[PDB]
Amino acid sequence: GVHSFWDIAGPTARPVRLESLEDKRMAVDASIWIYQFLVKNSHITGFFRRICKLLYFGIRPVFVFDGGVPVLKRETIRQRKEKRDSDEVTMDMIKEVQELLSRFGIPYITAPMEAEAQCAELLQLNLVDGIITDDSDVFLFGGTKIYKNMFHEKNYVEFYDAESILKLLGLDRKNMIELAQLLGSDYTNGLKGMGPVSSIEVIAEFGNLKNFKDWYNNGQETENKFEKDLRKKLVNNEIILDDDFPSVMVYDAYMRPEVDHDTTPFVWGVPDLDMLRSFMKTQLGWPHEKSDEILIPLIRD
Amino acid sequence: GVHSFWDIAGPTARPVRLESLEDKRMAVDASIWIYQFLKAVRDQNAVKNSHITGFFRRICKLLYFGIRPVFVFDGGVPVLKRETIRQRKERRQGKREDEVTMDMIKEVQELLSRFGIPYITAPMEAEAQCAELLQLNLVDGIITDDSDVFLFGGTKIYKNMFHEKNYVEFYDAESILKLLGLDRKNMIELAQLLGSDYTNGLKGMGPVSSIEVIAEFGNLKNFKDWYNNGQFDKRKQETENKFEKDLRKKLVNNEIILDDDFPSVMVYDAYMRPEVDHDTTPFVWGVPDLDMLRSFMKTQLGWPHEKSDEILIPLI
DNA sequence: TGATCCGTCCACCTT
DNA sequence: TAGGTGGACGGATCA
Ligand SMILES: [Ca+2]
Ligand SMILES: [Ca+2]
Ligand SMILES: [K+]
Ligand SMILES: [K+]
């Protein structure tokens, strides 16, 4: 995500009841779930409970898994750290969780690259009605209709949309991509000293990062209060704004991520009680009757 | 002062009405008033003789409530302070790589004497000398905002005296001890975690972590032994609890080194044995000299005598 | 000037 | 994993 971005977008949130999501097709960004569940087979327990919450409220989810890591992201990570192996164990957990999904009759895909980018594309193609994720990157990838904190234990979830963000904060997609280069994200380290308050002020005052850069480099005398304090801060943090600021690579990474444009509509099956019974028995030692108590209310006649 | 110390002592503060201080003898720590008035009072640059205006207004407030002040000025800067501060600056520089005149001092002291108010110059730090005055019962309280006064053994402190309020914040060592479990040695050892004029403290140690260290280990020697013994004999780590395993991880990440200067006897000695005047001769308060105050304010600030009279006559 | 305010930074926690 | 949070940090302001 973009660092501190939810602090900025937070006031535009609209609480909606879980009951209002009935029959909605929802892209579920599941790229990060296995890591969050890292008692044997906690990934299964974790996926099971979240899947049940979605289906309990009649949501029609499509699960999206990460594909590759793009180069800019790999680089930015690398500069921040500056019988089976881990990969094999990961492969197995993903496979098991996907087996669980299919027994629930829930479709899933593996994005070519970032899951959130793919989620945004699913919504653009009207293959889903909304996106369930807590990763603010989704906005920069052109996402809207985002449902955040879906898995907190509250009666409501937070609904965000690109329209409200524009109307209320004056921010469009290019603005958010530029905010990322101040705040930092997976694709850029941002600027030292630039938090959500200073970053928003910069966009509001200078409109864009080019003007921001120009005001800075040219000036290095009749500057107002705001400009004077900001310049000293940039100086004090040894900020250099060269020909790579703003970054065309960052812009392209968010504006043109690798996604699948396939327009085949997703198909939802019904949960397979028999196969879920045996799966849960095998994986976690649940008696069938225990599985039934949770799962039978999910079975239409 | 000791960094964040008022955050720690704050909840023991008791609000006291200025009216209650009538006839109290009060050591006034005036060591940074001049520089403060220089920086706090400007035009559109320092306004002229703001040190006179500033001192005059504060003196009148004290006299208005019948306080019997004795003003204390700094003498020298202790070597340990000069060393601490210069090292602090050197290391901050090594991360990125309006003056007080003798006449200003003489002027405010002339003002003081025309008010008939006794003043002294401490051999070194004013706060240390204030604590000594109280210990010898030459005064009944100390007016200062600088937390160092507790470490120098000051026990009855009046903070925010010149804020625009009906009350002043009273602090005493006995309440700090009783309510926070902190004695003088504890406070001096807190300084070595938090930082003060006499030590740059430890990275990562704010008021929360520093209080925890003193509570859990009792003293810095015990803390050091715990850290160092466990860093060497890793076997001693296996049995330590959550707090200790988390604290250790933090100190390591912060590259903390606790050597033979930790705790520092130089720091302890500087607070326990500051250079102060031990004279037991009581102070004598005079009466304000209206004639000489009139001419002083006239000369220094252009105040017509009638302006001075309007303020000074009720005080006399 | 020392203390306070407030925006930011950092690492742990929860998931 | 990574958003949130608790605690620390630091520059600008208070007074
Ligand atoms: Ca992302
Ligand atoms: Ca001091
Ligand atoms: K930043
Ligand atoms: K510290």
Residue numbers in the entry:
A (entry chain B): 2 to 39, 50 to 93, 761 to 898, 905 to 985
B (entry chain A): 2 to 45, 48 to 100, 765 to 983
Authors' text:
Rad2/XPG belongs to the flap endonuclease family that encompasses various structure-specific nucleases involved in nucleic acid processing. The unique feature of Rad2/XPG is the recognition of DNA bubbles that comprise a stretch of unpaired bases flanked by double-stranded regions and correspond to the DNA in the NER pre-incision complex. We report four structures of the Rad2 catalytic core solved in four different space groups, three of which represent the productive substrate binding mode and reveal that the protein recognizes a single 5′ nucleotide of the single-stranded portion of the DNA and a 3′ phosphate group of the ss/dsDNA junction. The two critical regions for substrate binding are the H2TH module with a Rad2-specific α-helix 12b and the hydrophobic wedge that binds the first base pair of the double-stranded portion of the DNA.
Complex II was solved at 2.1 Å resolution and comprised two protein molecules, each interacting with one ss/dsDNA junction. The substrate used for crystallization contained 14 complementary bases with two-thymine single-stranded overhangs in all four DNA ends. However, in the crystal a single T-T mismatch formed, resulting in a 15-mer duplex with 1 nt overhangs in one end of the duplex and 2 nt overhangs in the other. For the non-cleaved (3′ flap) DNA strand, in one protein molecule of complex II and three protein molecules of complex III, we observed the electron density for the phosphate group of the ss/dsDNA junction. Several charged residues line a pocket located close to this phosphate: Arg60, Arg61 (both from the N region), His830 and Glu831 (from I region). In complex II, Arg60 and potentially Arg61 (through a water molecule) stabilize the phosphate at the junction. The productive complexes II–IV have the same overall architecture. The relative orientation of the protein molecules is similar between complexes II and III but differs in complex IV. All eight independently determined protein structures in complexes II–IV are essentially identical, with pairwise root-mean-square deviations (rmsds) between 0.5 and 0.8 Å over 273 to 285 C-α atoms. When all of the protein subunits from the productive complexes II–IV are compared, the DNA superimposes very well at the H2TH module, but its trajectory differs significantly in other regions, particularly around the hydrophobic wedge.
